[PDB]
Amino acid sequence: FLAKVFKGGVIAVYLSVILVVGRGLVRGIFTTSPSTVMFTELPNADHLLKICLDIYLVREAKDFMLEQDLFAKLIFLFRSPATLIEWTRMS
């Protein structure tokens, strides 16, 4: 079944798929951008996990008034990096 239009054919699609797999799949999951490292390298996530569990609990307890306030608190914590690093300090 050879000679299936071998005019720069299967080799081109092979190179294209190799390039797209190398650039998109393995590269993205293998290394991290310098913007991400500031979020990934938190030394202690106990406080953030406690806040998220607390907002889940207050949502469950049918107290939607405080859920919005806790979400705003989390948004502000994730916005300002100084407050994030201060809040994430170990012990």
Partner: peptide
């Protein structure tokens, strides 16, 4: 020495010991 908290023992505690105190000097 009066500002730092915790003592780095394991590798994880050493990699994340960054604080402001050691950056309080002019680069030159």
């Amino acid at each position: 020495a009066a500002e730092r908290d915790f003592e780095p023992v394991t590798y994880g505690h050493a990699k994340r010991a960054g604080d402001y105190y050691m950056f309080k000097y002019d680069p030159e």
